[PDB]
Amino acid sequence: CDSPHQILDGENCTLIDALLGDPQCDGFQNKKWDLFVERSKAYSNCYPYD
Amino acid sequence: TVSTKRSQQAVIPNIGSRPRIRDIPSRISIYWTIVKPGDILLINSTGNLIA
Ligand SMILES: *[C@@H]1O[C@H](CO)[C@@H](O[C@@H]2O[C@H](CO)[C@@H](O[C@@H]3O[C@H](CO)[C@@H](O)[C@H](O)[C@@H]3O)[C@H](O)[C@H]2NC(C)=O)[C@H](O)[C@H]1NC(C)=O
Ligand SMILES: *[C@@H]1O[C@H](CO)[C@@H](O[C@@H]2O[C@H](CO)[C@@H](O[C@@H]3O[C@H](CO)[C@@H](O)[C@H](O)[C@@H]3O)[C@H](O)[C@H]2NC(C)=O)[C@H](O)[C@H]1NC(C)=O
């Protein structure tokens, strides 16, 4: 349930890929949130990194 | 260089004297790497590797 806490769905992005800005994760740019929800479907599409 | 598709480990050998144990003043540092299924371990070395 979304209403009480600001939910931000990660979809195909991890929190890190959004922070670094994997081009597919450009929608999450500058977005604040109360709860991020990393998905299991989420992949990383850009440069290999650890 | 011991590397996996998920992570990478790299170590440089540090030369120098160590107090001799069993008449052997050299030493060995041991590391470990776990490879999940569907991933591939690869080793790159130019020296001092005890694979
Ligand atoms: C999040 O990631 C998933 C999986 O990478 C995305 O689902 C995939 O979306 C693409 C298009 O965005 C689909 O490609 C197209 O599929 C249709 C229907 O099969 C086909 O007619 C086209 O030729 C093309 O292949 C892809 O099929 C779909 N994957 C699955 C398993 O359905 C999703 O779109 C991503 N969402 C976001 C916001 O990034
Ligand atoms: C730097 O300092 C270390 C510490 O002293 C040196 O290691 C020591 O080297 C001497 C060489 O004479 C070793 O003595 C040996 O003792 C055995 C004991 O059985 C004997 O059989 C040999 O004939 C010899 O006398 C000593 O064991 C060794 N280790 C220690 C803890 O003293 C080292 O040689 C110095 N130099 C360099 C370049 O590292």
Automatic annotation (TrEMBL), chain A:
Cell location: Host apical cell membrane; Virion membrane
Intrachain disulfide bonds: 13-25
Gene behind this protein: HA
The protein's name: Hemagglutinin
Assembly mode: Homotrimer of disulfide-linked HA1-HA2.
From-to range in the entire protein, with total length: 68 to 117 of 566
Function: Binds to sialic acid-containing receptors on the cell surface, bringing about the attachment of the virus particle to the cell. This attachment induces virion internalization either through clathrin-dependent endocytosis or through clathrin- and caveolin-independent pathway. Plays a major role in the determination of host range restriction and virulence. Class I viral fusion protein. Responsible for penetration of the virus into the cell cytoplasm by mediating the fusion of the membrane of the endocytosed virus particle with the endosomal membrane.
Reported modifications of this chain: In natural infection, inactive HA is matured into HA1 and HA2 outside the cell by one or more trypsin-like, arginine-specific endoprotease secreted by the bronchial epithelial cells. One identified protease that may be involved in this process is secreted in lungs by club cells. Palmitoylated.
Assigned protein family: Belongs to the influenza viruses hemagglutinin family.
Organism: Influenza A virus (A/Kansas/4891/2015(H3N2))
TrEMBL record, chain B:
Main function: Binds to sialic acid-containing receptors on the cell surface, bringing about the attachment of the virus particle to the cell. This attachment induces virion internalization either through clathrin-dependent endocytosis or through clathrin- and caveolin-independent pathway. Plays a major role in the determination of host range restriction and virulence. Class I viral fusion protein. Responsible for penetration of the virus into the cell cytoplasm by mediating the fusion of the membrane of the endocytosed virus particle with the endosomal membrane. Binds to sialic acid-containing receptors on the cell surface, bringing about the attachment of the virus particle to the cell. This attachment induces virion internalization of about two third of the virus particles through clathrin-dependent endocytosis and about one third through a clathrin- and caveolin-independent pathway. Plays a major role in the determination of host range restriction and virulence. Class I viral fusion protein.
Similarity comment text for this entry: Belongs to the influenza viruses hemagglutinin family.
PTM section of the record: In natural infection, inactive HA is matured into HA1 and HA2 outside the cell by one or more trypsin-like, arginine-specific endoprotease secreted by the bronchial epithelial cells. One identified protease that may be involved in this process is secreted in lungs by club cells. Palmitoylated.
Known partners and oligomeric status: Homotrimer of disulfide-linked HA1-HA2.
Coiled coil segments of this chain: none
Protein name as it appears in the record: Hemagglutinin
Organism: Influenza A virus
Lineage: Viruses, Riboviria, Orthornavirae, Negarnaviricota, Polyploviricotina
Subcellular localization: Host apical cell membrane; Virion membrane
